[PDB]
Symmetry: D2
Subunit: 726 residues, 4 copies
Amino acid sequence: SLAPEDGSHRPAAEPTPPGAQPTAPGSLKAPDTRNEKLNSLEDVRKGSENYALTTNQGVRIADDQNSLRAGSRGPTLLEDFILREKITHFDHERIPERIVHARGSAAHGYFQPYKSLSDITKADFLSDPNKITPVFVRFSTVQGGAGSADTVRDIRGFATKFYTEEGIFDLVGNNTPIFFIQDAHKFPDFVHAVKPEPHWAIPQGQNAHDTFWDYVSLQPETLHNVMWAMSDRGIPRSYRTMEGFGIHTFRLINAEGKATFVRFHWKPLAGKASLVWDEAQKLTGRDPDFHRRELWEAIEAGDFPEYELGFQLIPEEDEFKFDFDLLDPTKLIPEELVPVQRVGKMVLNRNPDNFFAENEQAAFHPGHIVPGLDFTNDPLLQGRLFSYTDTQISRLGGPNFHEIPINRPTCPYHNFQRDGMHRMGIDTNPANYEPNSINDNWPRETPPGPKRGGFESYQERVEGNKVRERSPSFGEYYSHPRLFWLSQTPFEQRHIVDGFSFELSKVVRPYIRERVVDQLAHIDLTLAQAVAKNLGIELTDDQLNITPPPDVNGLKKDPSLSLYAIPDGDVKGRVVAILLNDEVRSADLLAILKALKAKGVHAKLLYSRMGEVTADDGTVLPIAATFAGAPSLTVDAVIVPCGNIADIADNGDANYYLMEAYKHLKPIALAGDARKFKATIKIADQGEEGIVEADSADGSFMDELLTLMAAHRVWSRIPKIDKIPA
Amino acid sequence: SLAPEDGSHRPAAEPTPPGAQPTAPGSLKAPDTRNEKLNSLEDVRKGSENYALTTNQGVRIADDQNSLRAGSRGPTLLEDFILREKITHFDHERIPERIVHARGSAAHGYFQPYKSLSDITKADFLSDPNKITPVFVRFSTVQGGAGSADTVRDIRGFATKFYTEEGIFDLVGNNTPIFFIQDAHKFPDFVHAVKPEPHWAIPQGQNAHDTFWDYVSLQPETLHNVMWAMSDRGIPRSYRTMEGFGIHTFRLINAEGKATFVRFHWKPLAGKASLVWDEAQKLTGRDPDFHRRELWEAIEAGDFPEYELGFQLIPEEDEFKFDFDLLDPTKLIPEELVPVQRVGKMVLNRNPDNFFAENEQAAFHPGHIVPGLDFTNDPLLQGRLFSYTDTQISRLGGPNFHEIPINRPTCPYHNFQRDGMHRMGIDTNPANYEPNSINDNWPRETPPGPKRGGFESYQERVEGNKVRERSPSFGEYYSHPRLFWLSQTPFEQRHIVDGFSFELSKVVRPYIRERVVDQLAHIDLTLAQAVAKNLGIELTDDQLNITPPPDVNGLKKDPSLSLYAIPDGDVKGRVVAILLNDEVRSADLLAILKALKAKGVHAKLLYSRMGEVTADDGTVLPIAATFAGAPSLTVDAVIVPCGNIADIADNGDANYYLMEAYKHLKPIALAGDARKFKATIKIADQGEEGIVEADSADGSFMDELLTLMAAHRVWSRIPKIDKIPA
Amino acid sequence: SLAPEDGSHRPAAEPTPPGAQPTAPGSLKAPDTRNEKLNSLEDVRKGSENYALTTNQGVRIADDQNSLRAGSRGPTLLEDFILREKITHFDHERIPERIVHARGSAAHGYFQPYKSLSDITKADFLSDPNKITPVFVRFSTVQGGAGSADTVRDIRGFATKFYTEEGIFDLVGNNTPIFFIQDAHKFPDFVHAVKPEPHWAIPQGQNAHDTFWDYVSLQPETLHNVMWAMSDRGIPRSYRTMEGFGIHTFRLINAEGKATFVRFHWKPLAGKASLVWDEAQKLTGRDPDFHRRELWEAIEAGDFPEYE
Amino acid sequence: ISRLGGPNFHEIPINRPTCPYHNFQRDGMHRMGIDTNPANYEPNSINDNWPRETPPGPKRGGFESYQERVEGNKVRERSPSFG
Ligand code: HDD
Ligand code: HDD
Ligand code: HDD
């Protein structure tokens, strides 16, 4: 037996904070967390303890350490079927990654509505506040491969599979309310442009290259989502702290046959929070798995990710009332014009058991709708309906991808489809066609109706000639980017300017930079000038005279477009670094930990080596990581307790930890002699907002620290950070 | 409702004779038949009665008769996800067929040994006469595609999957005791030669072409199996009436580690029985699915195929005691030298539910052995071990083919292998490697032992240089073909001559026919001359003087090599055509059927049209088929009762029916005025052996017919048949 | 050398009647028959005479008769890359057959118009009677597998790939002028009904079974093509002696943008001819490759299949 | 066979030998080479046995494995020399 005597190999099957235990498969970490979908997977879950090691054919293996050979230094024999089986399975482990959103992290959970929606939709999963729908959610980046980093600048995917009693509904959205392009025909052009360039396959996880900015400069329809991507929305703090949007206008259909246009929203109950670019970029090197880790850990802690589903609803007769087209996926519907109605709440409360089996193989597709929903003519949505069925044939090996356990409906499914590679279902129906008399026509079509009815499309009127033509109503490109711009706070606007400036500086062909700046001059001259200045470009007189686009139905701003303008801070689940010394004042630590615990904020104890340090009263303190092994990038705030400060005062890593946290606008709190660190970050004696300081870590010290953490970052420190060499 | 009111759409769920009921899926036909494998497939069985028609996502379909279009004469819309799911699944229904043995028919059953064989093998499925092992058996041809015909001349496959408590054991045999080639390296050559020629892909299901005989003429090692293939062995009457052989010498390993050499045998308990060539050929056109049908129908009738497993056993110290090499797969072990020891019984007692899911997807592989068996150095076996794992990666879509339900072990299987296309099992093991401490090293290796132990190879001595060399001991090609020839009856010899003669007639390049005749001169000059003559070839003086090969260890014949030398007829499950007239004598019919029922022989009632006829006494006789629709090819004998014989006396089809049966040596019985039909087949007034005749269909009229049926065909008739124009 | 002294192994590279010579690959049989498409395949045609036997990696093989083994009666060694490459390629030879029309026989040829059609179509291949368009035609049955018999009673497929100067045009037709069903949504139902039944996979190449007639009895729209299949149309004598049809109304469009409705037809210059049922069925047993053989041999003889 | 889709990965252009390659292997997914050999097997008379095996020799000969002596029992055992 190889496990240590003390059982420390095995994580407690209780919720634990990040770092307290090794992470573990969901069914072993939280065996009592159940929902209908998780239970239905039980047929295929395979354990291991107490079982003999076998081939795939069930033959017990005596010696899994050696190939069969003729003498112990001789050649390997072809009759070694144990070796070849094991090697063959290994040799064929990989499947094709997703064409886009290959990098993503998933969890199980459940959803339920706040109130019946049967007045506007007959969808069963929205019909009853006490009917729970299992869900499986995958969050993702867009451009990079499955082994790329999490904290890149990109759009994020937010895909939700609802295993309803009337079929799978997949709501396949992103973290911004519009897309870069109008018609699915251009998707491969756009994606080829954003992806690594085809000669050398560079760069990974980055829009900062010529082809992407070339396409942008030539396709101003992209400018709206480009603005969102260049803002801090492009670098979320966590999948828990971003919005999700279905982007397209869909339809809701009630039992009376009435259609209402809807756009879908997820509101993060943990609040909206993003990183800053220097931090996000360096975090792709220090921990390329930061978002994956953080989501998995939040769930093991009990800090379940929660989202509120919301609908913008527009009656059918109001289709043409806005000064943008509701079917144009590059246009958003301002919440100032159409409020988001809250619809229900989704809680993600268990991680998967096997990433490959459940995450990699999950197939989400926006064509998977249920009665009570329907599509519209959105020309991007229309082409998506073709892609997500078609792509699984190579990705998942064939047309039986719905039989892969994660994908299976929990409701009944019966039909006359047969065969296909890796067919699991053994059909006993004498008939494989309909109409049939030999099985009395079963399974049977079901008329549409109020509940449990067959699917019928809404009978929308279609009147037009067969054309390949963009609707003229889609031909407006600048007003929504401007509305976005004007709705950001001054610091968010600076971050946008810095995002464009950084990205365009990596574009080798200078005319491409110029052409993008010219597009910026059509949105906002202040933005265009600020970017131009960073690129050493001077706007021409004509560019300076470009008339700014019109307001969006009278709006000069909409604060819901900003991450930060309206506070919605939630510290629960956030994490603080506590920089230890070899003689910690235990009275400081006790007060620190008590206040953090009261607000559900986690701590990591850091030192210049691993092992333990002993505090002033004999308490043995285990060290989670070194200053260098768990950098300030990975925490929300830094606290330094008193004690033997001379131990760490001249440690370069400890000093840098504070300089890096300071530059990235994080709250820092310094107790007792830790106040000596004020010098490294140039804080004046009288102190400064964003640095908490006191003789000791009392209740007052922690309240203030906790208040700053609720506001996420110390924006008012931005003018002070260009001086700092960090 | 589309089913008829009287419920006649639904086959009776009880044993019925062939043709009495429509055929049905095995679990609907025989719900009460069970074994441990059939029980374990229950989780994937899908019903159909009383369920709604859905998409694969569980969405109820309202209209499964139309596409979604813009207006009822308008274009189809891309948003029709119900149409595209359904067409996509249809578009990807097919998977590659097997490289060889693509054509095959399969049934579930069970095996039981007669007694424990623990003194000679530790194999668990042979350890206890009470231990019953589920099986799945697939029988097949070799050459033709999945859509080729059953009653071709070819070798047959007889593949058995034993679902043992210690793993899957696949016994992958043929119906002749040798193979055509010695070393696996030549398999693609031989198989390319026998297969349709690569320019034009002709001929299907036939060795009667130039490239096959070219190869054979250049590779005399193939002559042994060619003799079998050219005999009536190449055209079995039924998969129930052929022998099976593992071909190779394998090893049994007992609990003390002692190795015994073994060759595997299957003895058909329904006896040995073949067609004649003209019958077999025509039958590929009248019913290309005859063996598949016959197998399914035997099982639905309760005429379950039964086979006895037997072992020829040779002590290790006897390896070199014979004139041929035990490892040479072109050599048989005469039963006169090493008898077949009976081991156990196998009964196939349930048809599959879905042919594709269970039969097409089944993967058999002779490397799938269990503790208590091991391989030898037979260099054809040796290369087989590589192929049957390899081929599944394309054929079945990847390395998880063991998770396709029909292939799954019923015993436990646990290991560290992960991922791969269409992965079903969701592993919860924190470790995916060993050795590991984080799961205490589970699943763990198991030392070899008397039972329930790990697989260890037998420590055979290997000594020699790395060579691509054939063993000189394999370089004798004629003595076995000669023993086979001399062991055949004179009519079986005639049929061999005529098999070579017909096949060689289809070889377009005359020099190939001559080179084959030259090879036959090395085996037996009588055989060679008879073939030569049918080809217009004259043997040279040299050829006439070739010394015949030596006998095999003193044997100048072994009658176990003959199909018919030793009668072993069983009539149960055979079929008789009864040719009706419009006024049948009912006393004749009652007597016929009563005698047939007593012996388990089935009957089909034929006429010139469908519907019914009424017998002299008013009895209504249902007609199964017309004379033309169910030709004599498909039955084992023909009886014509009295009645209004004038009604059919001038019917070409009815006359021909008798001529065809007469030509193919089948028993024919004629009662009262049905004796008029003697003219059509030119029978003397005093009658002849093989034609039963009498005033009325009893006393001993049925005993005599039933006695002819036990002898299978009327061999004495052979000189009489060249006369008849049929 | 294994060939016979008198060279009778090699068929003459000149047209010869059926059975006179062994049949051969088309470029060895008729080396001077050329068209643009046939010439464009020259980069991928591989010969054989006078070349050494190699692996796929170009390594010359000394002994293509034996695996590598420890002793001449010993076990086969994993390091035998020659054997494993050869057996790997063999083990993966097959690809999925077509879902329908899996059984079919194909030939190269050419098309030429009788006159310019630019009044009714701007299609480039129809613009000038001197425009020669290479074609590749595959004839087929519908129901049976790639390995089933040719002279079954079935509809026949007649597919022509036109390699035009402005794109490939595939005219994918059958030998009757209608289809069994009205709407593509029902194609998997019709095809499952006609194909071998799912419990036992019987029968091959035949509509003569319960599920086919069940569907037909419940879907009267099928009756028209059913009538054609039940006539001697369902049993052609030869792919050379049957009609072809596109079935659908399509449109021609001319340079002015005017649309004309068109249905396509192929008229066989060898005339129309079919077997009788008893002969056809029996022929599926005596020569299940009869139509494939007869097409190949007509072309080798110079009886070129011609269609208008 | 999975990564590159089948047994014809050698016909993907980067992977192709620049020297001659001829054999009796046929078919497989994505088959590019169109073989004109009347024979797809050896030994064959119908194409005078071409392409032909080549004896090993000093230059341009067939591959033959070094005849290293093998001696021992069939074992799954690590050599003690590796320990
Ligand atoms: C016509 C092509 C096409 C277009 C126009 C879109 N996508 Fe898409 N999307 C795909 C074709 C596709 C795909 C190729 O089918 C993917 C990759 C593999 C897969 O399973 O689906 C995919 C994956 C994918 C995923 C990952 C799902 C998962 O986690 O497995 C998300 C979140 C989105 N997409 C979201 C969007 C949004 C919000 C779009 C515009 C509003 C959008 N896609 C446009
Ligand atoms: C080295 C390659 C090789 C050689 C020398 C053999 N075979 Fe084989 N055999 C295969 C390679 C193979 C295969 C390519 O792996 C097949 C085709 C598809 C499959 O799953 O296995 C196969 C299938 C196959 C089947 C069909 C199993 C089923 O019904 O699915 C049978 C009965 C046999 N073989 C029997 C034999 C016997 C008795 C042989 C000589 C003693 C033999 N094979 C030599
Ligand atoms: C909705 C599906 C569907 C429908 C309604 C049809 N087919 Fe089809 N057809 C196919 C789906 C298909 C296919 C599944 O896509 C095939 C099978 C394999 C392939 O490559 O294409 C095919 C093959 C195929 C072939 C063989 C081409 C070849 O030789 O490779 C012919 C001649 C036709 N079809 C002709 C027709 C005609 C004349 C139809 C009715 C007017 C028809 N098909 C309806």
